[PDB]
A paper describes a structure:
The most widespread dedicated NO sensor regulator in bacteria is NsrR, a member of the Rrf2 superfamily of homodimeric transcriptional regulators. NsrR proteins from Bacillus subtilis (Bs) and Streptomyces coelicolor (Sc) have been shown to bind a [4Fe–4S] cluster, which functions as the NO sensing module. In ScNsrR, reaction with NO was shown to result in loss of the iron–sulfur (Fe–S) cluster and formation of iron-nitrosyl species. This process led to loss of high affinity DNA-binding and activation of genes that were previously repressed by [4Fe–4S] (holo-)ScNsrR, including those encoding Hmp-type NO detoxifying enzymes.
We report here the 1.95 Å resolution crystal structure of holo-ScNsrR, the first for an Fe–S cluster-bound form of any Rrf2 superfamily regulator. ScNsrR crystallized as a dimer spanning a distance of about 80 Å, with monomers being related by a crystallographic twofold axis. Nevertheless, the polypeptide chain was resolved for 137 of its 148 amino acid residues and forms two loosely interacting domains (residues 1–85 and 86–144, see Methods section). Another similarity to other Rrf2 superfamily members is the highly hydrophobic nature of the ScNsrR dimerization interface, which buries a surface of about 2,050 Å2 per monomer. Unique to the holo-ScNsrR structure is the presence of a [4Fe–4S] cluster that is ligated by three cysteine residues (Cys93, Cys99 and Cys105) from one monomer and Asp8 from the other. The latter forms a salt bridge with Arg12 from the same α1 helix, which also interacts with the carbonyl oxygen of Val36 of the DNA-binding helix-turn-helix (HTH) motif. At the opposite side of the cluster Cys93 is exposed to solvent. The more buried Cys99 and Cys105 Sγ atoms are hydrogen-bonded to the main chain N atoms of Leu101 and Arg108, respectively. Otherwise, the cluster environment is mainly hydrophobic, without H-bonds to the inorganic S atoms of the cluster. Holo-ScNsrR appears to be the first structurally characterized protein with a [4Fe–4S] cluster that is asymmetrically bound by ligands from two different subunits as indicated by our examination of all the other [4Fe–4S] cluster-containing protein structures found in the Protein Data Bank18.
Numbering used by the authors:
A (entry chain A), B (entry chain A): 2 to 58, 65 to 144
């Protein structure tokens, strides 16, 4: 499962990607209302996207924002989280001699590689882009 | 992220896969001690694996248990959970016109397909199988 935070960050970028140059740099508020979350959640997401350099401005998508891959974004946004936790409160005795762990690393790489060919631009092509714009009508 | 329950079910199968024919059908207890969890957690996992038909017996791996793919097991064990929740407490307005959702479906399929070539047999090949047996020494 992907984090709510990761998905929401992606939603926010999608919303910023449909801004027709010379429409308006959106406020965080407008973004949060349109993508259907509270302000506070959207606020976190935007500040992170600013940390990453994919947004700036009033808010805008950067040169970088348009061209980065969705794979890269998810990798960055997922941050620390791993596919499995081999040492939580009760750490696993197979740690370090685990063939399953290796397989899950390969599987998780397959996941990100399926997303490397896409950009946010590709995600706001139709039908999605129109619906976002539709939601600001 | 994979569920603790899914990983633990896989741990339990791995433990059952190293039983040298005519060693001993393990009790749930022995499995839970060896894979490093409480009895109650292991108990759930085993009953599910019995529902799926990959274990039986005193506990044993079935004919089916040896040959099923790790991909199939994870798909079954993950059950209901989806890659993203497009309708939780605050459902997403992009539902049904979301290019991101489609991409994440492709990504998640890439994840399982990386695991389709493996079986539990492949996971308890070395170094893992020896360590499990080592943990019953
Ligand atoms: S069984 Fe393997 S992947 Fe699962 S927690 Fe243990 S070391 Fe990690
Ligand atoms: S942005 Fe797309 S994938 Fe994310 S919750 Fe909304 S419909 Fe689902
Ligand atoms: Cl490893
Ligand atoms: Cl869909």
């Amino acid at each position: 499962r992907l984090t709510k935070f990761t998905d929401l960050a992606l939603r926010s970028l999608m919303r910023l990607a449909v801004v027709r140059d010379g429409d308006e740099p959106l406020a965080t508020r407008e973004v949060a209302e349109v993508v259907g979350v509270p302000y506070t959640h959207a606020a976190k997401a935007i500040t992170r996207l600013q940390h990453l350099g994919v947004v700036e401005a009033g808010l805008t998508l950067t040169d970088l924002g348009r061209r980065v891959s969705v794979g890269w974004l998810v990798r960055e946004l997922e941050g620390e989280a791993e596919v499995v936790d081999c040492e939580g409160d009760n750490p696993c005795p197979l740690r370090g001699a685990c063939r399953l762990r290796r397989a899950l690393r390969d599987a998780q790489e397959a996941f990100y590689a399926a997303l490397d060919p896409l950009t946010v631009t590709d995600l706001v092509a139709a039908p999605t882009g129109p619906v976002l714009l539709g939601l600001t009508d």
